[PDB]
Amino acid sequence: QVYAPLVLRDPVSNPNNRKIDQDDDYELVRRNMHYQSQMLLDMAKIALENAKNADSPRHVEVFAQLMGQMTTTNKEMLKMHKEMKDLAGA
Amino acid sequence: QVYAPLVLRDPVSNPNNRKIDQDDDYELVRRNMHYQSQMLLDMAKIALENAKNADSPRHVEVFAQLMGQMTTTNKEMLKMHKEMKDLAGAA
Amino acid sequence: QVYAPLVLRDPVSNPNNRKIDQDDDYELVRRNMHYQSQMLLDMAKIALENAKNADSPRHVEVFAQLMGQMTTTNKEMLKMHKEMKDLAG
Amino acid sequence: QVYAPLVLRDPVSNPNNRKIDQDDDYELVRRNMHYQSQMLLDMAKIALENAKNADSPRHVEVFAQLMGQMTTTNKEMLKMHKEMKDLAG
Amino acid sequence: QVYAPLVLRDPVSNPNNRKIDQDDDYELVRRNMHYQSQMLLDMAKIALENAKNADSPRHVEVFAQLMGQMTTTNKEMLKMHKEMKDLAG
Amino acid sequence: QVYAPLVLRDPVSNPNNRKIDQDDDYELVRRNMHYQSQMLLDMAKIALENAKNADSPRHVEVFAQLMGQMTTTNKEMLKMHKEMKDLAG
Amino acid sequence: QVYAPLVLRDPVSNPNNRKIDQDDDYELVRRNMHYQSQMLLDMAKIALENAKNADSPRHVEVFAQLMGQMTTTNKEMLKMHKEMKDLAGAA
Amino acid sequence: QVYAPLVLRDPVSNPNNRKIDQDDDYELVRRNMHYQSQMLLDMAKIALENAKNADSPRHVEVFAQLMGQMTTTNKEMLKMHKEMKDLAGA
Amino acid sequence: QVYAPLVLRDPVSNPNNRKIDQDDDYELVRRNMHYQSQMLLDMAKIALENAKNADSPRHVEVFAQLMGQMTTTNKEMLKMHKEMKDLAGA
Amino acid sequence: QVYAPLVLRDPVSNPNNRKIDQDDDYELVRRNMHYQSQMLLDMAKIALENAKNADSPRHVEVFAQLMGQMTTTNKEMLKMHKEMKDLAGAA
Amino acid sequence: QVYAPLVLRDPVSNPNNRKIDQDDDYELVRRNMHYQSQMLLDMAKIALENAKNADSPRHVEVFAQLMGQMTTTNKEMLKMHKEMKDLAG
Amino acid sequence: QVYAPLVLRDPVSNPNNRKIDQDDDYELVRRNMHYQSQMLLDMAKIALENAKNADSPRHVEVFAQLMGQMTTTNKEMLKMHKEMKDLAG
């Protein structure tokens, strides 16, 4: 099964009314961060069980790497809100 | 395998009423951090006993690396409360 | 394959009326960021399922790498708006 | 060597009464730091005796690495308290 | 696969009337940034489909690398405008 | 081998009376530092003699690495006291 | 090969009338930057089509690296004008 | 000959009279630094002679590494005294 | 053909009249930068054509490295003039 | 080999009369720095002649590395006097 | 080969009349810088022609490395004069 | 190729009259810097001719490395004088 090619979607941009673009991009960024959280957790549950049953240092090592990424992605969720607070500021 | 594919859940966002998004995202981040705590510990207990019985420098090395990640992840839980404190504040 | 060769397209530039170029470049940058969001998500969905079923640390490792890039690229979106806020004016 | 899957437990969070969450999270973090101390020491005692008896630079090298992590993880306990002091401020 | 040698074209410079050079160089730089955007996107579209169909961590890894460069190169467009704003100052 | 499995021990935490936890954590951290001092020296004495007799650059290399870690771990002891001085209060 | 050896050209310098050296060196640097622009683009067009038709991660990887250098080199053109502006200024 | 296992020794700590702990830990740190100096010099003398007689770049390289560590360990001896001076300060 | 050995040339230095040394060293530095520019361009033209005709990622990669060095060497030409301006200053 | 084992010497320390420890430790550090000077030079003379006669890039490479360490070690001798000067001072 | 062994030469030092040593050391440093300029150029001319004729990426790679070192060593010449300006006095 | 062991010579130190030690150590440091200059130049002259005649990128690469160390070591001579100037202050 050859995967279906991606069809790109052009946004409508507003350089002289940027607030509406900023609103839209917040929604996009938020959506993506929720997606990442879901995907990382999904992978982690399986990677954990694989590592536990594998007596394989390699499996432990990649699980640790996954946790690292989960933490990084986690931290960015709160930073996003700080960034938005700053943007509404000056 | 073959594992059920992940079905993504699109959040509802509120760029002009962001406080409810912030509340929701705090709960999500906190949930995730608790999940990581549980997962890291579950892995660590098994990695430790495997390393102890392995007489294998590679096992000890990876265990040390796991401990490093556990520390890095654990540190962020209190950092998150500092972030939330600032988020409620002046900035 | 053989893929059609890329034909490059020249913009019209205005060094002494730069605001119009700045407007156009914002639209280009934002478009590319949306394109990247779309492409990263498309890759991630497949990479995730491949990694889940691979029974392979290598697959998980590259998936984590992909997530790292997704986060990095993602965080640049609000940075762009901060940049535009500073820029104008 | 066959393990039962991890059962995840959801915490209850309180975005508009965060202090009770902060209290609970301090207790979780401190617990985990104590766990890491215990696990690191447990590993170190065995890694030391293995390295002493192995006549193997590789064992010594990894024991040094372990001591490095022990120090790092150890340093974080007092940093936790400094963070909590700042949190209360 | 046999290519004609590059013929280099000399610009005319004006050390004591540099503003006309600066104008021309802005146009060249902006053109090149637009070219890079087009080339990166062109490569990305194909690299994505190859990675999706390869079931290969190596393809995913390199696609991530490409996205990284796309973001970096993309970030530089607005930086160009900030630089030009400072130049005029 | 098979080694007895580690049984983890939970501390009792006091988020609203943290000084008592801070006291206990200082004692734990100091104990671990003394333990590390003792273990590093124990390893070093054997690693030194092994390296002296090995006729092996690898042995000397890892011995130097061990000394580096010993110094790093060692220097943290007085840093701890500086940290405690800042902490209280 | 065997390519004609390079014959080096010694400039005439003026430590006590440096402005003419500065003028000359600006022209040289600008010429070189334009040459690099031309060379990088000429390479990029071919590297791109080779990478597109190669189904080869190595080709994509090196193309990305080439793009990185192109960005780094391209950035210096405007930085050069800033440098020249400062050179005319107070400092 | 299987080496005798290490028996760990618990210190007595005093969170509310820390000065006596600080005195004790200075003595421990000082002792260890003197130990390191002695061990590094002991290794270096042998590593030097081995390198001189080996026409082996590898031997020279590790001797250089040893000297690096000796210098680092050396520097920390004086820094220890500066640290102690600061601790008696405020 | 064994290359002719380099015969080194000692400069005359003037620690108590350093301005004349500074003039001379500017001329030397300038000469070298012009030499580098010429050599880098000379190599680049050939490296470019080799890369174009080689369908070899390795050739592209080294050409990119060469361009990196050309840019670095380029930037230093202008920095040299800034350095000289500063030296005539205080 | 088998070399005589090292017999460690425990110093007598004075946390409440630290000046005599400082005096002693200065003498020790200075002695060690002089020892390193002697050892580095002794090694360098032989490494140099070996490298000169080796027609071996590896020999030249390691010699360069040795020179690097010699510079780094040599620099610390005067840094030590600065440290001692500060130790006598206000801080 | 066997090359004549190097005979080291001791300078005469003056800790309580350092200016004369500083003068001599400036002359030594400047001499070495001129020597390095001469040696780098000598190597570069041959390395360039070798690289041009080698049909070998490795040759070009090391040539670029050589150019990097030439630039680094070259830029230190005017830094030296800045250093001397600060030094005296 | 058989060498006599190094005989270490103990200096006499004066913690409570440190200026005479400082004077002696300046002379030792300066001597060593002059020695390094001589050794580096001696090696460089031979490494250059070897690299010129080797038609070997490896020889060029290592010659560049040597020039790098020569510059670094060379830079330190004037830094020594700056340090001494600060010491007297």
- In F, which residues are within 8 Å of B48 by CB distance? 6
- In B, which residues are within 8 Å of F58 by CB distance? none
DSSP secondary structure letters along chain G: --PPPP---PPP--TTSHHHHHHHHHHHHHHHHHHHHHHHHHHHHHHHHHHHHH--HHHHHHHHHHHHHHHHHHHHHHHHHHHHHHHHS--
* Residue whose token pair is 């992590």: D69
Q: Are F48 and H40 in contact (CB under 8 A)?
A: no
Is the backbone of residue C4 left (phi > 0), alpha (psi -120 to 50) or beta? beta
I77 touches chain K (CB under 8 A): no
Method: X-ray
Chain CA centroid to CA H1, Å: 27
Q: Which of B87, F17, F21, H16 is nearest to D88 (CA)?
A: F17
CA–CA separation, F20 and F14 (whole Å): 8
CATH number for the domain formed by residue range(s) B17-91: 1.10.287.1060
Q: Are C67 and A35 in contact (CB under 8 A)?
A: no
Please tell me which chains touch D, using 3 or more CB pairs under 8 Å as the contact test. Answer: A, B, F, H
Q: Long-range contacts of range J87-91, CB-CB < 8 Å, 24 or more positions apart?
A: J87/H78, J87/H81, J87/H82, J87/H85, J87/J22, J91/H82, J91/H85, J91/H86, J91/H89
Q: Which residue of H has its CA nearest to D46?
A: H5
Given this structure, which CATH class describes domain L17-89? mainly alpha
Q: Are D3 and B46 in contact (CB under 8 A)?
A: yes
CA–CA separation, D84 and D81 (whole Å): 5
Q: Is H10 exposed, middle or buried (0-12, 13-18, 19+ CB in 10 A)?
A: exposed
Distance from CA of J27 to the nearest CA of K (A): 21
G89 touches chain I (CB under 8 A): no
CB contact under 8 A, A55 and D1: yes
DSSP H stretches of helix in chain H: 18-52, 57-87
Q: Which whole-number Å values give the CA distances from L84 to H77, L25, L72, in the listed order?
A: 22, 11, 19
CB contact under 8 A, A70 and B36: yes
CA-angle at C35, arms to C32 and C36, nearest 5°: 90
CB contact under 8 A, G65 and I64: yes
Which residue, among K18, K19, K28, K37, would best test binding to I if mutated, counting the most I CBs under 10 Å from its CB? K37
CB pairs under 8 A between A and D: 11
Query: For chain G, what is the radius of gyration of the CA atoms?
Result: 19
Phi, psi of F59 (to 5 degrees): -60, -45
CATH number for the domain formed by residue range(s) I17-90: 1.10.287.1060
C15 touches chain G (CB under 8 A): no
* Residue whose token pair is 């210190």: H11
Which residue, among D69, D81, D85, would best test binding to B if mutated, counting the most B CBs under 10 Å from its CB? D69
- In D, which residues are within 8 Å of A55 by CB distance? 1
CA–CA separation, C80 and A22 (whole Å): 9
CB contact under 8 A, F26 and H42: no
DSSP code, position H10:
P
- The three-state DSSP-derived secondary structure of chain D is CCCCCCCCCCCCCCCCCHHHHHHHHHHHHHHHHHHHHHHHHHHHHHHHHHHHHHCCHHHHHHHHHHHHHHHHHHHHHHHHHHHHHHHHC
Q: Which of C2, C28, G63 is nearest to E43 (CA)?
A: G63
CB contact under 8 A, L76 and J81: no
CB contact set of K58 (below 8 Å; sequence gap of 6+): L57
- Tell me the domain boundaries of chain D: 17-89
CB contact under 8 A, G49 and C5: yes
DSSP 3-state of B25: helix
CB contact set of A35 (below 8 Å; sequence gap of 6+): B8, C41, C44
Q: Long-range contacts of range G1-9, CB-CB < 8 Å, 24 or more positions apart?
A: G1/K52, G1/K53, G1/K55, G2/K53, G3/I46, G3/K49, G3/K52, G3/K53, G5/K49, G6/I38, G6/I39, G6/I42, G6/K45, G6/K48, G6/K49, G8/I35, G8/I38, G8/I39, G8/K45, G9/I34, G9/I38
Q: Which of C71, G67, G37, C38 is nearest to E69 (CA)?
A: G67
Q: Which of E17, E42, E26 is nearest to E86 (CA)?
A: E26
F29 touches chain D (CB under 8 A): yes
- In F, which residues are within 8 Å of J2 by CB distance? 53
DSSP secondary structure letters along F24-79: HHHHHHHHHHHHHHHHHHHHHHHHHHHHHHH--HHHHHHHHHHHHHHHHHHHHHHH
CB contact set of F12 (below 8 Å; sequence gap of 6+): none
Q: Which of F6, F36, F79 sits opposite D38 (nearest CB)?
A: F6
CA–CA separation, A51 and A48 (whole Å): 5
- In J, which residues are within 8 Å of L18 by CB distance? 26, 81, 84
Q: Which whole-number Å values give the CA distances from B4 to C53, C76, K32, in the listed order?
A: 10, 32, 70
Q: Which residue of B has its CA nearest to D66?
A: B64
Q: Is F12 exposed, middle or buried (0-12, 13-18, 19+ CB in 10 A)?
A: exposed
CB contact set of G34 (below 8 Å; sequence gap of 6+): E9, E10, E11, E28
CB contact under 8 A, H49 and L1: no
Please tell me which chains touch J, using 3 or more CB pairs under 8 Å as the contact test. Answer: F, H, K, L
* Residue whose token pair is 């240092």: A57
Burial track C4-28 (b if 16+ CB lie within 10 A, e otherwise): eebeeeebebbbeebeebbebbbbb
Q: Which of G76, K27, H76 is nearest to F78 (CA)?
A: H76
Q: Which residue of E has its CA nearest to C56?
A: E57
DSSP code, position E26:
H
Q: Which whole-number Å values give the CA distances from H27 to E75, F78, H8, J32, L15, in the listed order?
A: 55, 11, 18, 21, 21
D16 touches chain A (CB under 8 A): no
- The three-state DSSP-derived secondary structure of chain L is CCCCCCCCCCCCCCCCCHHHHHHHHHHHHHHHHHHHHHHHHHHHHHHHHHHHHHCCHHHHHHHHHHHHHHHHHHHHHHHHHHHHHHHHC
Q: Within 10 A of J6 (CB to CB), how many other CB atoms are there?
A: 17
Q: Which residue of B has its CA nearest to F5?
A: B49
CB contact under 8 A, E6 and I55: no
Q: Are J32 and H41 in contact (CB under 8 A)?
A: yes
Q: Which residue of C has its CA nearest to B5?
A: C49
CA–CA separation, F74 and H36 (whole Å): 10
List the end-to-end C-alpha distance of chain B, in Å, as a whole number: 49
Q: Are I69 and K68 in contact (CB under 8 A)?
A: yes
- In D, which residues are within 8 Å of B61 by CB distance? 62, 65
CA–CA separation, D17 and B30 (whole Å): 14
Four-point Cα dihedral A54, E55, C64, B13, nearest 10: -130
Q: Which of I74, G43, I69 is nearest to E32 (CA)?
A: G43
Q: Is D88 exposed, middle or buried (0-12, 13-18, 19+ CB in 10 A)?
A: exposed
Tokens of K43: 């190597």
Tokens of G45: 């067009």
Chain CA centroid to CA G30, Å: 8
B60 touches chain F (CB under 8 A): no
Type of residue found at L61: E
Q: Are I43 and I69 in contact (CB under 8 A)?
A: no
CA–CA separation, F12 and F16 (whole Å): 12
